[PDB]
């Protein structure tokens, strides 16, 4: 007998109750029963993205055969899972695959149509060295074999729709990936078997939180596969926490730990403006607007078919543009440089646009993606930084129309890029001196209206209609940039404590460092690099000269024109 | 029992102490027991590396079973291992080995959740049983995987997993990537201390703990084929057997680290590195001793570590005419620090004068020349992250070169146009030019080196930006080598020529006057010593190869390279 | 030609066998490092190609062997020329 | 046959990632083939033909000597080939 060498009787296993109580999927079982009762072409092929429980559909079919929920043409059938990996096992010689396969087909003809065959992973059957479609193909055609195929959508349209004969001997039954609520119903169906195996209890709020977090924070794996993965691994984790040396009920906190490893954010975002002024002082208005945008995004009030932040940053450099972006991605999601910076001074032509979107099919930069779109397809929860967007060719703003309205961009390889989890930041200088010359005792609203009119003469009318809010980036005064220099001295003290030194300063040295490179026309970044050079050259040179010892009072005392470092 | 016929019980051997004690790997055993006590995905597979203790994790698991340190669910479990050739011992018939394997699987179904099966080289067992009118191992165990009658534990390399188990469907979703980390040095020390007693009681010798840390450190430092911790265990046991041979043939038992060094060489850093540097410089490169000492100072100030490691090591402008061994200096730096000739990067910037500079060098925009090429600079450092970079002819640059140079001298870490992150801080960046070389060819004589350096640095400040050259470590001067260094380098060329002629079977000594004719004919201030090489080739070897084939020069004579009025002649005496 | 390896390879995990192996680098890299069920029963004795010195020594001993067969006087310049010219002009 | 003459005729028509194979050849004389091994090229005479300075040499060979013409057409070749490659040529000649 060749069936017992290679098949697995599913209905006999469901008779002993080893299979899963498949709950749901009723219309797919009904369409499969419609297919298996035709005259010719009785062969459904279950098609969907992987993980969605297609073997579960055939297990439910076998359980309906055991119970008798089938029509009066399927009572008494046997469902036999065939193993295409097992027929190509000893493929040494000529005509040894065909011996096994013809033994299977003779024994299926022997049963007089009483056996539903289940050939999972149907893409195996096409390439078998002619081979394997051409012995099943006439018996598939006449409907005297009842092969329930089951294969991936992409494997189906890559292997089987290439071959039209084997394609028409089957019939598609498209399997919809289940919803979040349907996953909840699945887990409520399968709670009892896991609580009777792990001997623990499972809390139902942790179940619905597990399904919700699995659907939200995992995009590769699909429901219910990732959900039952999280439940099973948390059940085993609680099993070993009991079984080591103390809870038996799984909470959703353990679910979140398994999700992150493998809600005080509300209280943080209430003080998010304080969090943004933790690292950059001054520029209250952009802090308020960005904190409002993040609060509306985490509150979910905003339209979820839009990006988070459409913000046109203006004004001269060094007023706290990129430091704000770094601390924003830090206190928002992860880090100062878990982001993307794009220098838009590069892009100045039409092939610039084809660079940042991606080359079309048949051209040079095709297989190596775009530049924007690849950088976002790597990091879907990130921050996009367009350095000097005014320097661009004027058609890049058409791409950014698509970006800032729809949150989707279609690269050159023909796929879409999701922008509904990132923040677009655009830096410009179209009104820098206009705000510098009129910052004194002129308010925020009229300055915004003036620079809005100027940039509206600069930019297209379609693109200015897409922005959430255009901040001004007013020039900071003497005490503001002096406090910025104080913050730079504090983070320099942090870096030297990372180096392992305790270095003091004179207040006169602080005043000279604040008055080295102060300019409202370029920002604090000349002041930053001036302090950086005038400290990192002589002090770290005296470190390399063999003077400084970790644990001595090191006062940055003033010279006549310089700053001397002492050892006391 | 067919299990008692040709399978291996590991728990009986751990109960009888016939196995290796395992110290470490607590996290991996804990995650393995997380993976085992499930209902779906019951079988783990130990993805590891060739020699990182994949067998030792299951050995320690069986020892925790015997010692009862396991959780309650795995108490009483008997881990039986699967043995290949024992099952293929007496089985050649049509259906004898396969019937044996089926009886093994019937026994595994019979024990009813009591036996964990362990299979080393899982992919091999899936592709082993090449029989006739029969079946293999993989597609007979494959029913037992997705039927719950097997609590299997796998062990394989990552690559054969990524070929043979990720490709399948049921074999994929019945197996779990319990990744095994390659252990650290001090973890290897702890493991060797856990097994020092076994080897000492075996070989009747003693093992020193400084020898243990020296063996572990130098095994991770030098050995590339094997991995931790197996190479250290092999070094310990090979040293033990070598001391046993010293007892036997031609009286010690304490294995010291000197024995480890003798075995490993038959198979320390800072000041020795400094002295080897400062000595081995003068062998290849002749002269330029100011630059020798300056590179020695830069090496000291870089490897002190007291500065910022957020900047690359090399920031050097090397000035002087061509033919002074700038390439020899770069190759000497590679020969010491990275120990090769072409452990280096030479890029000639005398062609990127136009706008197409960052495109060709760093990485091109698509639709251009360098885009289907990779990148002359950043993809070169992708090829050699651990190397030295040379920038010839920095004076032929473009304003979109200095931007790359400013980003390098600030950071070292860099990103090309495609958008991937490179870092330069393990490398050396060397630039060269020849702007002030006319002044150096004019008045290097009767002038010093310090004010020479300051004056040519002023010339650089005429040509370059001060803040750009502010980030340079040091600029040295390559003087025009005139008489004795020319004599030495022509002597080197003649040494290799003498070596080839002596292996041919002649003996040639040059006159000093003929070497003076080489110096006057091969050296020029505008080029240096490349006309030295081609003039040596022409004026020596072409009459010499004319004469040797001529049936004139008998072996065994001192062939004096005398002088003609303007030629160099090879005479016999 | 079960035939030999399933009768001798099990003795390696039986301790009855103390064999000495000999193979090319290619068969160790193809048929033994892939054969991972037997990796820690062997040790890679990397026999290197001998240099010109050891070649000349081996050729002197085998000169003493070969002069009983060809009945010739092999001269030592021919030995050093054989070692050198075989090292250079044959890859 | 290790002692042959290798003619690489009209080499400037080739695609510029064929010259890297020839960089291996003119660097070391060993060349890694497809099957894996290496082939000793240190007994061959590798001769390449090209005409990259056609208009230049037809225009200016009069009133110019051999060395300056070699320098000028070598600069043209430097625009075409690599300087990593034509440094490894033993002797460019100019017709
Ligand atoms: N309607 C359902 N009722 C009960 N369990 C389900 C249901 N849908 C899916 N599952 C479970 O989800 C998992 C999916 O099992 P499989 O059918 O083997 O996976 P799949 O959906 O077929 O995807 P592939 O391509 O076979 S990996 C199993 O644990 C099923 O028990
Ligand atoms: N000190 C030296 N010792 C030995 N050979 C040397 C020495 N200096 C120069 N040479 C030789 O002279 C050659 C000159 O080559 P280069 O180093 O390229 O000359 P250069 O002065 O660096 O001019 P460029 O810019 O590199 S073309 C070297 O390749 C060596 O063969
Ligand atoms: N912690 C440990 N305790 C005991 N033995 C160990 C330990 N780590 C490594 N070993 C030894 O090193 C060897 C390496 O094992 P493994 O990585 O499984 O080899 P392979 O990679 O060839 O399968 C083991 O056979 C074991 O004897
Ligand atoms: Mg399936």
Curated annotation (Swiss-Prot), chain A:
Chain spans, region NBD1: 1-177
Residue numbers binding ATP 2: 315-322
Effect in UniProt of substituting residue 466 to A: No effect on oligomerization. Loss of ATPase activity
Cellular component aspect of the GO annotation: cytoplasm; cytosol; membrane
Induction, as annotated: By heat shock and other environmental stresses.
Spans annotated as C-terminal: 476-567
Primary residence: cytoplasm
Effect of mutating residue 262 to F: No effect on chaperone activity or ability to form oligomers
Domain of life: Bacteria
Region (NBD2) residue spans: 265-475
Residue positions where N6-acetyllysine is found in the record: 18, 350
Effect of residue 321 to T: No effect on ability to form oligomers. Loss of chaperone activity
Phenotypic consequence of residue 96 to A: Decrease in ability to disaggregate proteins due to decreased substrate-binding activity. Retains hexameric quaternary structure and ATPase activity
Effect upon mutating residue 99 to A: Decrease in ability to disaggregate proteins due to decreased substrate-binding activity. Retains hexameric quaternary structure and ATPase activity
Keywords: Acetylation, ATP-binding, Chaperone, Coiled coil, Cytoplasm, Nucleotide-binding, Repeat, Stress response
Alphabetical GO biological process terms: cellular response to heat; protein refolding; response to heat
Effect noted on mutating residue 529 to A: Loss of ability to form oligomers; loss of chaperone activity
UniProt comment concerning the protein's domains: The Clp repeat (R) domain probably functions as a substrate-discriminating domain, recruiting aggregated proteins to the ClpB hexamer and/or stabilizing bound proteins. The NBD2 domain is responsible for oligomerization, whereas the NBD1 domain stabilizes the hexamer probably in an ATP-dependent manner. The movement of the coiled-coil domain is essential for ClpB ability to rescue proteins from an aggregated state, probably by pulling apart large aggregated proteins, which are bound between the coiled-coils motifs of adjacent ClpB subunits in the functional hexamer.
Assigned protein family: Belongs to the ClpA/ClpB family.
Role according to the record: Part of a stress-induced multi-chaperone system, it is involved in the recovery of the cell from heat-induced damage, in cooperation with DnaK, DnaJ and GrpE. Acts before DnaK, in the processing of protein aggregates. Protein binding stimulates the ATPase activity; ATP hydrolysis unfolds the denatured protein aggregates, which probably helps expose new hydrophobic binding sites on the surface of ClpB-bound aggregates, contributing to the solubilization and refolding of denatured protein aggregates by DnaK.
Additional observations: One peptide binds per ClpB hexamer; the binding site is formed only upon ATP-driven oligomerization.
Protein name (record): Chaperone protein ClpB
Organism: Escherichia coli (strain K12)
First-to-last residue of the parent protein present: 159 to 857 of 857
Swiss-Prot record, chain C:
Entry superkingdom: Bacteria
Compartments where found: Cytoplasm
Inducers of expression: By heat shock and other environmental stresses.
Signal peptide (from-to): none
Description of how the protein assembles with itself and partners: Homohexamer. The oligomerization is ATP-dependent.
Miscellaneous comment as given in the Swiss-Prot or TrEMBL entry: One peptide binds per ClpB hexamer; the binding site is formed only upon ATP-driven oligomerization.
Task of the protein: Part of a stress-induced multi-chaperone system, it is involved in the recovery of the cell from heat-induced damage, in cooperation with DnaK, DnaJ and GrpE. Acts before DnaK, in the processing of protein aggregates. Protein binding stimulates the ATPase activity; ATP hydrolysis unfolds the denatured protein aggregates, which probably helps expose new hydrophobic binding sites on the surface of ClpB-bound aggregates, contributing to the solubilization and refolding of denatured protein aggregates by DnaK.
Similarity comment: family membership: Belongs to the ClpA/ClpB family.
UniProt note: domains: The Clp repeat (R) domain probably functions as a substrate-discriminating domain, recruiting aggregated proteins to the ClpB hexamer and/or stabilizing bound proteins. The NBD2 domain is responsible for oligomerization, whereas the NBD1 domain stabilizes the hexamer probably in an ATP-dependent manner. The movement of the coiled-coil domain is essential for ClpB ability to rescue proteins from an aggregated state, probably by pulling apart large aggregated proteins, which are bound between the coiled-coils motifs of adjacent ClpB subunits in the functional hexamer.
Protein name: Chaperone protein ClpB
Gene (name only): clpB
Residue numbers of the full-length protein present here: 287 to 382 of 857
